[PDB]
């Protein structure tokens, strides 16, 4: 199966002018495995999954030193951003960043990522070529020129095609029992008599891993994603996921609807009906 | 493992 690694940064200024808060969390697929939070007397990177605990103290210190340094630099970056947008010191603002690597079935790098948002909207992103930027506005264009002068893209490319894929592969081996396991969903269909000559059919998927799934309702063969309530894939808490999908049918009787579910854990797509 | 930012990496 294909896998990814991402680091998620938030640098948030405090409303007034207290020290901004910097947080970094690291994921392999949907599994959190590190966290650093700058709001502490002596902040350290901490483990969040069992399989990362085996890394020695030099690994932890390298992480911690990167994050402590980012804590300092992102504070200036925040000051830079509110300057570009003529914003005052009162008011909280945020820089969010995600970067990391996608590998495919082969274990080899499919694509690399480095995207930034300011106050919740796309600000600057590393293009797929890993050598050019997409800048949102003239302010992001100021950031682009700084990052071109500093060869950021080049160094991110080196990381992404080097360090990133290497460590991802390492974490994928160390935690293979959970990261390289795909659990199929437990599926069923619920009937909800709304009474109207109308009813809701709901197709359930429980206990799957990983999170990526497809649930669609079919009217005698045809996909109808319009008029289909498709709820968000949600953590069940025990490192599995859940999802459902619903359609309003003219039941009386009217049972020509099937639910179709695709998931990696599954040998072949399932097709299910309501069994009264 | 995260990437280290070199000097002048500010926004």
């Amino acid at each position: 199966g294909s896998h990814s690694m991402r680091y998620f940064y938030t640098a948030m200024s405090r409303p007034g002018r207290g020290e901004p808060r910097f947080i970094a969390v690291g994921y392999v697929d949907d599994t959190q495995f590190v966290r650093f939070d700058s709001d502490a007397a002596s902040p350290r990177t901490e483990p969040r999954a069992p399989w990362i605990e085996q890394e020695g103290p030099e690994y932890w210190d390298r992480n911690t030193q990167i994050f402590k340094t980012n804590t300092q630099t992102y504070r200036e970056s925040l000051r830079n951003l509110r300057g570009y947008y003529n914003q005052s010191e009162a008011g909280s603002h945020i820089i969010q960043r995600m970067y990391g690597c996608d590998l495919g079935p082969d274990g080899r790098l499919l694509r690399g990522h480095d995207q930034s948002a300011y106050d919740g909207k796309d600000y600057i992103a590393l293009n797929e070529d890993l050598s050019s930027w997409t800048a949102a506005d003239t302010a992001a264009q100021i950031t682009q020129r700084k990052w071109e002068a500093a060869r950021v893209a080049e160094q991110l490319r080196a990381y992404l095609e080097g360090l990133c894929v290497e460590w991802l592969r390492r974490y994928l081996e160390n935690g293979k029992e959970t990261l390289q396991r795909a659990d199929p969903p437990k599926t069923h269909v619920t009937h909800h008599p709304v009474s109207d000559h109308e009813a809701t059919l709901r197709c359930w998927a429980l206990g799957f891993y990983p999170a990526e799934i497809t649930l669609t309702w079919q009217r005698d063969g045809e996909d109808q994603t319009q008029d289909t309530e498709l709820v968000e894939t949600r953590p069940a808490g025990d490192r599995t996921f859940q999802k459902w999908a619903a359609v309003v049918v003219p039941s009386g009787e009217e049972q020509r609807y099937t639910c179709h579910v695709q998931h990696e854990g599954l040998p072949k797509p399932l097709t299910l009906r309501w069994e009264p | 493992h995260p990437v280290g930012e070199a000097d002048y990496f500010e926004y």
Partner: T-cell receptor
Amino acid sequence: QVTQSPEALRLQEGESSSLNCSYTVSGLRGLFWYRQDPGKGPEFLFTLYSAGEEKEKERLKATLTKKESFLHITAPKPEDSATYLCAVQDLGTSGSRLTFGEGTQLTVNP
Amino acid sequence: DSGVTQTPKHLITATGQRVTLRCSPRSGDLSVYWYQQSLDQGLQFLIQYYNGEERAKGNILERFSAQQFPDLHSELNLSSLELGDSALYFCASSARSGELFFGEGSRLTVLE
């Protein structure tokens, strides 16, 4: 982390040679060559970033593998005599600090 | 050659004394890195400043200290000098493209 060899190089004028730099890092940010003359600060020569990359200027040509860099010096002259420093930046560390090898001290016999 | 300006170029002092070394980065660079080159050993990273604040360190001794001033100039203070402190002290400023540019050095000799 950075080891240079040989530490002392004794060449006849005209005798080409290659200076070796081995490095270990989490990930290479850049490999650097500097020249240092007795009593002066290191002077910039080249930076290389990726395996297979090469840079050449006059009698010096620097190349890079994933394990080492070579500074080849073709038909050297007395004036090439100096210490040659190798240094590396790491992608697992912040900022731009260099960690240096111990240098190759070259003397070219005229 | 090179832009980075270091004073004093030479220092002779006694054991137990304190000295200050001064470094101006190249115009346009915002960082100062301090290195020590001891007799028979390679350059060793001491400490980095960026735009007036401490950035990174450095196997710098507790009896050594440094600062970068709002001016960007930097000072390295060496306290309680021992004979083994005799060495060349280099500072470098980093460019946006990542290259370090070095000063001409301060040679310190400490004498009994």
